[PDB]
Amino acid sequence: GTGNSKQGPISAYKRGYSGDLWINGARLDGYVTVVNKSNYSNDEIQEKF
Amino acid sequence: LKTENIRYFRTAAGSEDVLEVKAYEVYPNVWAIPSRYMMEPLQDLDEVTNPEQFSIYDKKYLADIQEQDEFLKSIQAAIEDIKKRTFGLELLTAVSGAVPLPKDTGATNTTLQCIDENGKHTHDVVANVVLWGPGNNLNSNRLISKSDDDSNGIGSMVELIWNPQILIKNIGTNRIKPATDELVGLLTKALFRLYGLGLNKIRYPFYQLDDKKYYSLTAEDLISYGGFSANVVNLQPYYFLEDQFTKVKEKYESAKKRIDDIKVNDEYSQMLTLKYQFDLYSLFHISTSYIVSTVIPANDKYGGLVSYYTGPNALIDSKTDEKLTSMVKIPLKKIKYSKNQSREYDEYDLTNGEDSTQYFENFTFPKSKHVFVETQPTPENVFVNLPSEEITKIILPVIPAESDLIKIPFQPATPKSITTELITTDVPTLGLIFPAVKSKQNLSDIKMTSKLSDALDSDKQTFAFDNTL
Amino acid sequence: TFKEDHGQFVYDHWGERLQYNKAYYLLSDDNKSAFETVYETKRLKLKSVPGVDIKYLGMNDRVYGYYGGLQFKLVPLDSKNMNNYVRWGDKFTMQSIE
Numbered sequence: 076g077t078g079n080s081k082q083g084p085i086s087a088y089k090r091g092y093s094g095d096l097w098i099n100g101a102r103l104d105g106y107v108t109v110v111n112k113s114n115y116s117n118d119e120i121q122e123k124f
Numbered sequence: 125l126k127t128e129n130i131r132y133f134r135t136a137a138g139s140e141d142v143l144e145v146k147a148y149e150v151y152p153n154v155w156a157i158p159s160r161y162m163m164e165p166l167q168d169l170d171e172v173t174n175p176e177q178f179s180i181y182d183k184k185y186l187a188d189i190q191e192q193d194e195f196l197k198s199i200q201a202a203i204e205d206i207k208k209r210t211f212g213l214e215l216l217t218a219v220s221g222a223v224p225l226p227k228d229t230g231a232t233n234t235t236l237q238c239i240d241e242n243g244k245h246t247h248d249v250v251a252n253v254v255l256w257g258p259g260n261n262l263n264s265n266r267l268i269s270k271s272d273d274d275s276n277g278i279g280s281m282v283e284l285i286w287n288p289q290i291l292i293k294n295i296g297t298n299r300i301k302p303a304t305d306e307l308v309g310l311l312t313k314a315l316f317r318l319y320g321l322g323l324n325k326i327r328y329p330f331y332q333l334d335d336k337k338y339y340s341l342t343a344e345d346l347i348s349y350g351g352f353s354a355n356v357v358n359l360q361p362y363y364f365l366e367d368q369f370t371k372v373k374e375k376y377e378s379a380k381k382r383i384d385d386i387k388v389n390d391e392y393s394q395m396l397t398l399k400y401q402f403d404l405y406s407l408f409h410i411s412t413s414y415i416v417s418t419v420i421p422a423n424d425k426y427g428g429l430v431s432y433y434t435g436p437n438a439l440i441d442s443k444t445d446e447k448l449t450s451m452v453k454i455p456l457k458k459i460k461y462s463k464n465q466s467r468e469y470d471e472y473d474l475t476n477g478e479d480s481t482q483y484f485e486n487f488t489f490p491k492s493k494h495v496f497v498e499t500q501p502t503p504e505n506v507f508v509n510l511p512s513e514e515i516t517k518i519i520l521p522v523i524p525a526e527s528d529l530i531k532i533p534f535q536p537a538t539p540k541s542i543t544t545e546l547i548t549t550d551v552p553t554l555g556l557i558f559p560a561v562k563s564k565q566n567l568s569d570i571k572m573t574s575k576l577s578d579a580l581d582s583d584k585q586t587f588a589f590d591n592t593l
Numbered sequence: 594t595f596k597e598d599h600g601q602f603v604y605d606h607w608g609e610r611l612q613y614n615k616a617y618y619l620l621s622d623d624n625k626s627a628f629e630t631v632y633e634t635k636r637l638k639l640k641s642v643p644g645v646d647i648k649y650l651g652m653n654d655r656v657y658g659y660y661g662g663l664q665f666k667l668v669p670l671d672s673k674n675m676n677n678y679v680r681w682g683d684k685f686t687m688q689s690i691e
Contacts, residue, residue, distance in 0.1 A: 077684055081670060100505040100621050100639050101211045101414075102512050108210050118299060120418040122210065124505075124621075496654040498644075504623040508639045 076107065099124045125149040126522075128238040128249055133270065134534055136162035142529065144243070147236055148196055150203050152220040152519060153252040155236060158195040160186040161259035161268075161285050163534035169450065172260075176539050177472070178436050179261045180290070180451040186257045198288045198303070198442070199255055205304045210414040212308070214507040218402060218410075219311050221515035222252055222318035223395045224279030225379060226386045230523045233271060234281045237529055238522065245529070247522040250392070251281055253314050258287040259536075263431075263439070263451075265306050267313050270532060275322035277375035282314045289442040292430050294419050300445065301419040301430070308415045309428070312348040319399075319407060320379055321372050323347070328364070329480045330354065330427040337477025341427045343368075347408060350416055351424040351503055357408050359497045366488040376404045391520050398511045398518070406510065411503030429474070436472055454542040461559075462550040464581050469555035476540040552576040560587035603679045606659060611679035614672070616664045616690050618642075627662025637663070664690040 076096040078085055087093045095110035125148075132143035143162060150156045160166060169181045186192040206212040227233035235248035258264070266285040274280035288303035316323045321344075328346065329338035341349075343365060346356050356364045365372070380400040387393060416423065426433050436453045440446060456475050461467035549556070560579035563570060563586040572588045573579050579587040602610040611617070620627050620642060629640040642661030647654050667685040669677065679685070 079684075081686070099210055099414075100508060100623070100626065101214055102507075102638065103213050103217060103516065104210060106637070106639065118297075122414050122418075124210075494653060496649070496652060498654065498656040500623070502623065505621065505626070506624070508621070508624055508626040508641050513638075 097124060125152075126249065128236070129240075130155075130157070130249075131237040131239045131243070131245060131529055132157075133237065133529060133532055134163045135531060137165040142243075144239065147249075147251075147254070148200075149249075150199055150255065151216050152516070153223060153250055154203070154216070154219060154255065155249075155251050155253070156196060156199045156255040158186065158192045158199065158257060160257040161283075164259045164536045166260050169452070174539065174541050175452045175454075176261055176264065177454055177542055178263060178431050178439055178451050180263060180448050181260065182262055182450065185262065192257070195257055199286075202288055202304045202307055205302065206308060206311075206415060209304075209308075211412070211505065211507060212415045214510060214512045215308060215311055215315075215410075215412060215415060217512045217515045218507065218510055219253055219314055219318065221395050221398050221402075221511070221518070222279065222315055223250060223392065223399060223520070224252070224273060224281065224318060224320070225277075225382060225396065226388050226392065227278075229386060229388060230525055230527075231388055231392070232525075232527070232530065233273060233278070235523065235525070237525070245526060246524065248525045249522055250520040252318050253282050253284050253311065255284045255286060257285070259285050262287055263290040265310060267310050267317065268534065269317050269324075274317035274320060275325060275375075277320035277379040279318045279320040279379070282317050284310050284314065286310060290448065291440050291442055292420065292434055293438045293440045293445075295434065295438050297419070299419045300440065301423075302417055303442065305416045305419070305423075308412045309348050309350070312410055312412055313344045315407060315410065316344045316347070320375050321404075321407065322375060323372065326368060327478065329478070329483055331429070331474065331477075333474055333477040335477070336481060338480045338483075339427070339429070339474045340478045340480060345428060347410060349428040350413060351411065352427060353425070359499045361492040362490060363487075366490065369490065373404060376400070388523065389521060391518050395515065395518050395520065398514050402510045406506045409504060409506045411506065413503050432472060432474060455544050456542060457545040457547055459553060459555045460546065460548045461552075461556055461580050462548055464583055466583060467556055467559045467580050469553070469559050471555060475542050552580055556580055557587060562586075601680045603681065603683075611667065612675060613667050613669045613677050613679065613685065614675040615666065617667065618659055618661065619663065619665050619687070620659060620661070625657045625659060625661075629662050666690060 076098060078094050092109060096107040097110055099106050099108050127148045130145050130147040132145050134143060136143050145157045145159055147155045147157050166183045167181055168183050172181050186195055206216055224234045231250055234251060236251045237245050237248050239245050265287060268283040268285060270281035286307055291303060292301040323343040327340035327342050330341045331339035333339060343356050383396045384393060420430060422433060431439055436451060439448055439451060441448055455470035456473040457471040459469040459471060560576055571585045573585045574588055574591045576587055579585045604610055618627060624641050626639045626641040628637045631638050640662055642658045644658045645656050647656055665687040667679060668688045669685055
């Protein structure tokens with residue numbers, strides 16, 4: 076989920092976050108997790124869905 | 125998330141008094157008692173007759189009130205750390221919605237007895253997992269069941285002895301394998317006891333030892349330790365659990381029938397409808413691959429022998445992030461080098477294996493359906509069968525009981541001793557590279573070499589694998 | 594050779610390049626589980642898609658089912674027509690079909 080719409084970037088009040096979201100198979104995460112781009116995301120294995 | 129004063133259903137190391145503990149609800153139907161496991165006698169290092177391996181002993185640890193509120197802040201920071209992992213709170217929700225079948229109206233098989241300011245037992249609170257402190261042994265993370273209902277189909281309340289203060293460290297990477305990696309490994313195993321699957325009794329060979337004895341694991345231990353080869357669930361004509369799946373299926377698919385046999389609430393009957401909606405395929409294929417960390421690149425090979433794989437040098441403390449310095453490290457073999465002494469390789473391996481030599485010969489196979497089932501060697505998400513949002517909308521009310529307490533005795537494990545061989549080798553071995561590759565001097569005086577037969581002989585030189593380095 | 598044969602396209606399960614304005618069953622690749630609306634509302638619940646009892650060369654194989662749950666077009670950002678292909682880096686908008 077890119078976080079933008081055709082009207083520009085989606086409000087984090089409406090959406091919940093601001094940037095990219097991987098789409099997972101987990102409810103109770105809302106089938107989304109934040110794409111981690113910090114300097115710790117390659118310290119372990121990424122676990123892509 | 126309530127907090128009660130609980131009159132416990134056990135007695136503190138043979139005191140025969142009522143044990144009144146302060147329980148806290150850290151997840152729905154998941155209670156934390158941040159006191160040590162009072163039911164086994166808390167000893168010091170000098171009081172223990174035959175100590176376990178990698179087994180730091182210490183009294184007075186959660187007797188203090190300040191450092192036992194530091195223990196609750198370590199459980200509450202751990203369940204908040206499982207919740208922040210993908211599929212993490214769907215495991216915690218599976219544990220929340222795994223309420224065992226009631227023995228009677230109310231629940232005198234799964235509840236903690238709550239008591240007022242004075243000790244008048246006024247109501248009891250529904251528990252699935254009670255998350256106790258360490259026992260006598262500080263790193264002995266166990267999953268003590270309340271009843272023997274875990275092998276019955278009813279499901280049993282589970283006491284989870286767990287210590288977040290002792291961690292395994294990737295020594296090459298300096299990444300600490302987190303506390304919650306063994307907590308998710310035990311909440312997984314709690315699901316097989318809360319569903320009444322008798323998968324903790326039969327132990328299957330997993331690691332042949334040096335006398336052709338087997339380090340054996342249960343189907344609970346095998347499934348809960350994440351991905352692993354020799355899968356329980358290797359479909360190739362389902363082989364594992366020879367004539368034992370038919371027992372586990374009869375335990376599951378009979379308890380699904382007796383679901384309105386005894387009525388407790390409109391919410392206890394509503395969680396029990398949602399409990400047997402997670403099918404038996406989903407339990408045996410629980411993968412917590414997204415929740416455990418890939419800190420140790422091999423964690424899905426061994427059968428939870430992370431401390432033996434990495435060595436005891438990797439066992440550290442949470443507050444210090446250095447070695448424990450008080451664990452009894454009793455090796456299996458002391459391999460000593462002849463041409464220069466003090467090059468000992470202490471081989472911490474396993475001993476006292478089971479005698480399962482006639483296991484792969486007497487292997488019964490189930491009656492196969494003669495169907496190739498298209499499978500995929502990676503794990504699966506299996507919580508799509510779990511009614512995970514429907515569990516979270518159900519909070520079970522407190523039940524007015526005012527009935528007296530039934531006490532259940534706790535008889536611990538009787539561990540065998542580790543007899544240490546003292547081997548003296550006249551020749552370099554693979555084990556004597558560990559001794560040779562370590563050193564205790566600075567760069568000006570290190571004197572590296574690329575030869576075992578000089579590092580092992582001198583005790584001034586250090587082994588390396590590349591003459592340029 | 595196998596990675597570079599695929600080029601810069603995103604593919605179907607069948608191995609054919611993805612297309613905008615094409616009815617796609619969106620599945621999970623591990624359970625092969627597909628989306629489904631909660632009873633009356635517009636919230637989604639991932640539900641499992643049942644397998645297929647085939648005969649493969651006279652045998653009785655049981656293979657992954659794929660026709661389950663909600664279908665989703667991939668509408669591009671200003672709509673062109675159907676048979677345009679999706680590449681790595683192509684942003685779209687998953688439109689429900691039902």
